[PDB]
């Protein structure tokens, strides 16, 4: 049983 | 794109070969398989980025290297059983994880070199019957008694090559499929009209492109040696 | 240290409704104390709630990948780390610590406080009765409510407004789900 | 100073079911190694971003360099620093102030205290099954070195030479590197830990805490078991 | 409504600081430790049934470091409001003149998330068995942080809970005794 | 970690729609769809963990929670022709380690509007000592079958050069005197109307 993480997203430039 | 050079390859039982990959996609995550005729894809190791190595099914016998991130080559040492396989290589995208594949190379290992044979290529006219019946002209070229299967036909008319009508087997088929160091056969066929045929001009050649022995390996016997050659047959036209 | 300070937070929040059968995700993008960017999978795509959070939505909309994965985010993330905790974090039961004594040292006739020490308790679902001699007791009941520990367990006081006469016994009925039968611990004034 | 290794404290390579080439790779020939130079930006409170070309094969412009405390990290966050160490590409992740980088653990020395004429050779006591099997010298143009610097030089000729890393396993079942400096004394385990997969990160950690040993003084001896 | 798992992430600049933590009903799963790169859980129990990769963590907070310096340039580089923190303290079980207990210091309701909590006893500082959580996310964004301290129950001896913020014109003090 | 591919091989007509089915035993992050040309070249249709994904004629569908994936082709093309592989990449154990399905094997039939069989003696080359029959023209709906003779060789299809359309065609050879065009394709379901010339 291995915890699943959300991948953060990159702001506009 | 992905480069995996040479397309067909060739050495003796015990000799070390090593198959190059190239990819200019910039991608991190490069792949390692082998196909077996009538198989799927087994893979044998995996790198996901510069200096990480991965293991897989099939990774007894073989070892890789990753010193760049664009090259990623495979070596098959002597401790592999079986190394005769169609070697596949790809890469993942970094943001759209896609995985891209290459051409793909041909590797055959054998314990005696004297299985090792030329292709005896030979053009049969088409019948007279056909050319009045249907209003056309069926040549066909035959390569056979060659090992390995590494063979490349291509048809040449009057000194240019010719793709159009033209019906070539995707892989060669084994004389004997009982047998382990079995002789290959390929064919193919060329359509073209009946007036083209009836034009003696008109030049028809099959050309055959095989890939065996290098100036490297020894050979003893009488026959003449099957090396890197074209073997060539030609027709004319008949009225 | 008269520097300025600047923070950036993110959070993905998974609501659970009924167990698992109905799965909220929210994600949440927070410059200070102030909320620019969200997505609610009962929306389906992000939603800006600050000027500022405008041009990202527009940016994350425009890929179709990008709100796909977020789309099976309540399956591939939600209900999958659901699962993955749910032995020590959903079913975690913990028998509470039930102690009852007077709040102050005071003799018979004269009002006091009766404390229900209750602590050491997973989770939060607790209900806590008062009686007087076997009768319910509704009025005058002080609690101090719900207090979070920190280390997986809550505590919680309630107290009972009594005048006690003589031989008066006083019991404190705790029900919790990890006890089949509701906890009693008696009181003789 | 620090206690030899105990009969099991030592990893065994026969216990590591993965590949060798990943612990191989951070003691080969490529490592990171700069001259004279001063971090452009800071990831976290214990780090620190310097800009380092790649002119061998070009696989890294900026490189990270972690240290155990804050302390570690503003104590070399202005000085004109010499970078030398293994560095590793999984699992390496940071962003530099407004493409291609590395990560590595500690290996800095200042360049205004330091430096040499000549290069100073320290000898090199290689021990298999505690009996003598070769012995050769390790050359620096530095008084105070690092103990990753004269590590991956010692594991370097070790892996060209005797082979001590392969590509599936190793030769030796364990092995130990000890720096011996007149009355104090410390060692780091050299095979990698019991499983099926080797963390580079996790490995050269030990590195953090940025031990400096005087080349003057310095006596380096490797212990390692047959299998 | 019945059970919440939330995944708070936080950067902070210009200390440099960053956190990445799993939560479930206000309390703690775990939390990776940026320095060791290791999955530190809450309690000891829960590493034997669950597992997390540490190193992706990392991954999170280099894109929460660039997401900070664009979005402080966009708002024209505006400072965080210092709000004070809510000091309570109160025991883990009721007290008993021989049987041991904890004493928790709930540092509820503050921003930005940096706090100096120090355990007084008659005066002096007290470092002997200390336990702390990491700091905890809240739906008004604000931070919660809990300090735990073993101590003997005696009828001679005080307990004070030093917090010091930004939000705060003086140290704060939360006086307990028997 | 088990990958298994439904139908092993699939008979089309051109111009036909058919679904391919791909199921895993266990939870995938990443999912990829494959079609290897006749010549072994490996063409990335989709990369579909999750939802629904479109290009050109061809249709992806994959259900995370369900552990399946669908593969929809609209209107054959006789280039469609070869073998569909299904790539996944398991949760259970390593990232990106992408595991091969059996295959669904695909041969696209197409649909002949002038239909002449007949079985041709081709002239012999003064360089070989094989005799050479031609089975050409024929519909697709008849199947070429190999000799029941070893020393006898027949090729059941070839694949048109990537460049004007083409007739259904099967070559026949053998070294021996017994081997006649008449009695050449008798293990293979010839057809009625079968030309065959004095």
């Known amino acids: 049983p291995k915890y699943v993480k959300q991948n953060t997203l990159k702001l506009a430039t | 794109g992905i480069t995996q050079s040479p397309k067909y390859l060739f050495r003796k039982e015990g000799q070390n070969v090593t198959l190059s990959c190239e990819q200019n996609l910039n991608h991190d995550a490069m792949y390692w398989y082998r196909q077996d005729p009538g198989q799927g894809l087994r893979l044998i190791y995996y790198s996901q980025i510069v200096n990480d190595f991965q293991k897989g099914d099939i990774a007894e016998g073989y070892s890789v290297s990753r010193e760049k991130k664009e090259s990623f080559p495979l070596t098959v040492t002597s401790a592999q059983k079986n190394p005769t396989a169609f070697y596949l290589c790809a890469s993942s995208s970094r943001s759209s994880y896609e995985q891209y594949f290459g051409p793909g190379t041909r590797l055959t290992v054998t314990e005696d070199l004297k299985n090792v044979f030329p292709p005896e290529v030979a053009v049969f006219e088409p019948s007279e019957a056909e050319i009045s019946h249907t209003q056309k002209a069926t040549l066909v070229c035959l390569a056979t008694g060659f090992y390995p299967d590494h063979v490349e036909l291509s048809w040449w008319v009057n000194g240019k090559e010719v793709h159009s009508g033209v019906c070539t087997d995707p892989q060669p088929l084994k004389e004997q499929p009982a047998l382990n160091d079995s002789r290959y056969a390929l064919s193919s066929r060329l359509r073209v009209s009946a007036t083209f045929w009836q034009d003696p001009r008109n030049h028809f050649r099959c050309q055959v492109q095989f890939y065996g022995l290098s100036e490297n390996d020894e050979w003893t016997q009488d026959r003449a040696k099957p090396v890197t050659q074209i073997v060539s047959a030609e027709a004319w036209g008949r009225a | 240290d008269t520097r300025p300070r600047f923070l950036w937070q993110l959070k993905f929040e998974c609501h659970f409704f009924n167990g698992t059968e109905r799965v909220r995700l929210l994600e949440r993008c927070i410059y200070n104390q102030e909320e620019s960017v969200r997505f609610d999978s009962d929306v389906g795509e992000y939603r800006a709630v600050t000027e500022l959070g405008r041009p990202d939505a527009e940016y994350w909309n425009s890929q179709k990948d990008l709100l796909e994965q977020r789309r099976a985010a309540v399956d591939t993330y939600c209900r999958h780390n659901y699962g993955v905790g749910e032995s020590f974090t959903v079913q975690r039961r913990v028998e509470p610590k039930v102690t009852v004594y007077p709040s102050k040292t005071q003799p018979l006739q004269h009002h006091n406080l009766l404390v229900c020490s209750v602590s050491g308790f997973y989770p939060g679902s607790i209900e806590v009765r008062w009686f007087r001699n076997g009768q319910e007791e509704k009025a005058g009941v002080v609690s101090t409510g719900l207090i979070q520990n920190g280390d997986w367990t809550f505590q919680t006081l309630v107290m009972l407004e009594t005048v006690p006469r003589s031989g008066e016994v006083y019991t404190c009925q705790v029900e919790h789900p990890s006890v089949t039968s509701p906890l009693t611990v008696e009181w003789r004034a | 100073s620090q206690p030899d290794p105990k009969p099991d404290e030592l990893h065994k390579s026969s216990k590591f079911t993965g590949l060798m080439e990943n612990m191989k790779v951070l003691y080969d020939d490529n490592h990171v190694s700069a001259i ?192 | 409504e019945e059970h919440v798992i939330i995944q708070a992430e936080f950067y902070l600049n210009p200390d440099q600081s960053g956190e990445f933590m799993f939560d479930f009903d206000g309390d703690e799963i775990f939390h990776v430790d940026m320095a060791k790169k290791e999955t530190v859980w809450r309690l000891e129990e829960f590493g034997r049934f669950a597992s997390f990769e540490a190193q992706g963590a990392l991954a999170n907070i280099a894109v929460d470091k660039a997401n900070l310096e664009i979005m402080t340039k966009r708002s024209n580089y505006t400072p965080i409001t210092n709000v004070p923190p809510e000091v309570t303290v109160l025991t883990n079980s009721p007290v008993e003149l021989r049987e041991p207990n904890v004493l928790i210091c709930f540092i509820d309701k503050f921003t930005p998330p940096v706090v100096n909590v120090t355990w007084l006893r008659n005066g002096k500082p007290v470092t002997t068995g200390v336990s702390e959580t990491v700091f905890l996310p809240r739906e008004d964004h604000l931070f919660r942080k809990f300090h735990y301290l073993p101590f003997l129950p005696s009828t001679e001896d005080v307990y004070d809970c030093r917090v010091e913020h930004w939000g705060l014109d003086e140290p704060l003090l939360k006086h307990w005794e028997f | 970690i088990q990958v298994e591919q439904s139908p092993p091989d699939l008979i089309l007509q051109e111009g036909a729609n058919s679904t391919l089915r791909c199921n895993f035993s266990d939870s995938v992050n990443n999912l990829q769809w494959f079609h290897q040309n006749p010549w072994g070249q490996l063409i990335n249709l989709f990369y579909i963990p999750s939802g629904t994904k479109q290009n050109g004629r061809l249709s992806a569908t994959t259900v995370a929670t369900e552990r399946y994936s669908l593969l929809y082709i609209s209107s054959s093309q006789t280039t469609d022709s070869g073998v569909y592989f299904c790539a996944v990449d398991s949760a259970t154990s390593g990232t990106y380690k992408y595991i091969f399905g059996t295959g669904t094997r695909l041969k696209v039939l197409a649909n002949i509007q002038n239909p002449d069989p007949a079985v041709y003696q081709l002239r012999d080359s003064k360089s070989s000592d094989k005799s050479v029959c031609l089975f050409t023209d024929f519909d697709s709906q008849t199947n070429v079958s190999q000799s029941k003779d070893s020393d006898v060789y027949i090729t059941d299809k070839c694949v048109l050069d990537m460049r004007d359309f083409k007739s259904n065609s099967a070559v026949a050879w053998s070294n021996k005197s017994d081997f006649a065009c008449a009695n050449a394709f008798n293990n293979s379901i010839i057809p009625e109307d079968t030309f065959f010339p004095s």
């Open chain 4, 36 to 227: 004279n130079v001063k971090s452009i930006d800071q990831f976290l409170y214990f780090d620190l971003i310097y800009s380092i070309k790649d002119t061998k094969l070009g696989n890294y412009d900026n490189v990270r360099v972690e240290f155990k405390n804050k302390d570690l990290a503003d104590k070399y966050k202005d000085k004109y620093v010499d970078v030398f160490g293994a560095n590793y590409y999984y699992q390496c992740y940071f962003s530099k102030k407004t493409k291609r980088k590395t990560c590595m653990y500690g290996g800095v020395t200042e360049h205004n205290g330091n430096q040499l004429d000549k290069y100073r050779s320290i000898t090199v006591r290689v021990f298999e099954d505690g009996k003598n099997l070769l012995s050769f010298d390790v050359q620096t143009n530095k008084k105070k070195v690092t103990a990753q610097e004269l590590d991956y030089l010692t594991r370097h000729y070790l892996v060209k030479n005797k082979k001590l890393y392969e590509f599936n396993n190793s030769p030796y079942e364990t092995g130990y590197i000890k720096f011996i400096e007149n009355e104090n004394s410390f060692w780091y385990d050299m095979m990698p830990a019991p499983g099926d997969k080797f963390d580079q990160s996790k490995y050269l950690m030990m590195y953090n805490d940025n031990k400096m040993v005087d080349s003057k003084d310095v006596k380096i001896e490797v212990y390692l078991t047959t299998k």
